Amino acid sequence: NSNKLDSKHSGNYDYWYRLFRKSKLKPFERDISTEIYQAGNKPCKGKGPNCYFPLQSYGFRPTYGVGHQPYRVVVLSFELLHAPATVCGPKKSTNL
Amino acid sequence: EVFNATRFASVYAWNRKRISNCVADYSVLYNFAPFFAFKCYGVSPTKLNDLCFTNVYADSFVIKGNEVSQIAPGQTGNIADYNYKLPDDFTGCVIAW
Amino acid sequence: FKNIDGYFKIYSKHTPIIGRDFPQGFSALEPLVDLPIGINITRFQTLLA
Numbered sequence: 001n002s003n004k005l006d007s008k009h010s011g012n013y014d015y016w017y018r019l020f021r022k023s024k025l026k027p028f029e030r031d032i033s034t035e036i037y038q039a040g041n042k043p044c045k046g047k048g049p050n051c052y053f054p055l056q057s058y059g060f061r062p063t064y065g066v067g068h069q070p071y072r073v074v075v076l077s078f079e080l081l082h083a084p085a086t087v088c089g090p091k092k093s094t095n096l
Numbered sequence: 097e098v099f100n101a102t103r104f105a106s107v108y109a110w111n112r113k114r115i116s117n118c119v120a121d122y123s124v125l126y127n128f129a130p131f132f133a134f135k136c137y138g139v140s141p142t143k144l145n146d147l148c149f150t151n152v153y154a155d156s157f158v159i160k161g162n163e164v165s166q167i168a169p170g171q172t173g174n175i176a177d178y179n180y181k182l183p184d185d186f187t188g189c190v191i192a193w
Numbered sequence: 194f195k196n197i198d199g200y201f202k203i204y205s206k207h208t209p210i211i212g213r214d215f216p217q218g219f220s221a222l223e224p225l226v227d228l229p230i231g232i233n234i235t236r237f238q239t240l241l242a
């Protein structure tokens with residue numbers, strides 16, 4: 001939980017998140033874009049009715065509920081396959 | 097009949113309609129109002145025709161402009177505190193036109 | 194070239210083959226670089242001299 005950096009007086013709406021996309025996300029694939037979702041059949045380009053901005057603000061304040069707190073999430077991806085590795089922990093080197 | 101009404105009640109007395117025994121098609125909702133705030137919290141505006149629900153409540157009330165942004169789970173204000181409070185765990189949508 | 198889960202893979206084998214065109218005798222390919230691009234690729238183009 002990170003409410004000491006992701007919150008300030010009078011709020012903070014710098015963060016973003018997408019609710020409107022034409023299709024699904026494939027695993028580990030970024031889709032950064034600002035294209036207004038198509039509603040009905042209109043080629044409408046803009047804000048308002050049946051023309052929605054793809055992403056809305058993820059605004060955070062110091063006073064929210066626990067489910068509404070600015071949680072900081074980082075994920076780690078590993079590749080435990082047969083390949084030359086790079087990262088290890090403690091290392092001894094007893095002779096072969 | 098919930099969106100073709102002519103006397104949408106005020107926020108202090110919000111009329112609550114219990115919708116039961118019907119097929120919820122959202123195209124009649126899409127063609128009836130040129131929306132300005134169709135934000136959802138528990139479902140997706142796009143994903144509504146492929147989920148089946150037990151009961152549906154349609155609370156209808158005419159309100160000011162800023163109060164539209166006021167109406168949301170986990171909010172505050174003269175409406176969110178004294179007139180109509182949306183629970184933080186709300187599974188539904190709001191429509192403003 | 195391939196772009197499964199990123200990890201761009203380049204395979205190659207250089208040899209002065211008969212030289213008419215694509216040969217008929219079998220030849221293997223030895224991977225040279227395997228580098229994790231992790232981006233989206235849709236279109237392909239070649240440069241000249």
Ligand SMILES: *[C@@H]1O[C@H](CO)[C@@H](O)[C@H](O)[C@H]1NC(C)=O
Nearest residue numbers: 026028029030031233234235
């Ligand atoms: C990659 O590009 C294709 C076509 O340009 C597009 O359909 C697809 O959604 C893109 N994927 C990502 C993860 O950007």
Ligand SMILES: *[C@@H]1O[C@H](CO)[C@@H](O)[C@H](O)[C@H]1NC(C)=O
Nearest residue numbers: 097098099100101127128129
């Ligand atoms: C009410 O229904 C009529 C008949 O379909 C339609 O023309 C009209 O636009 C509707 N008005 C509202 C406010 O839903």
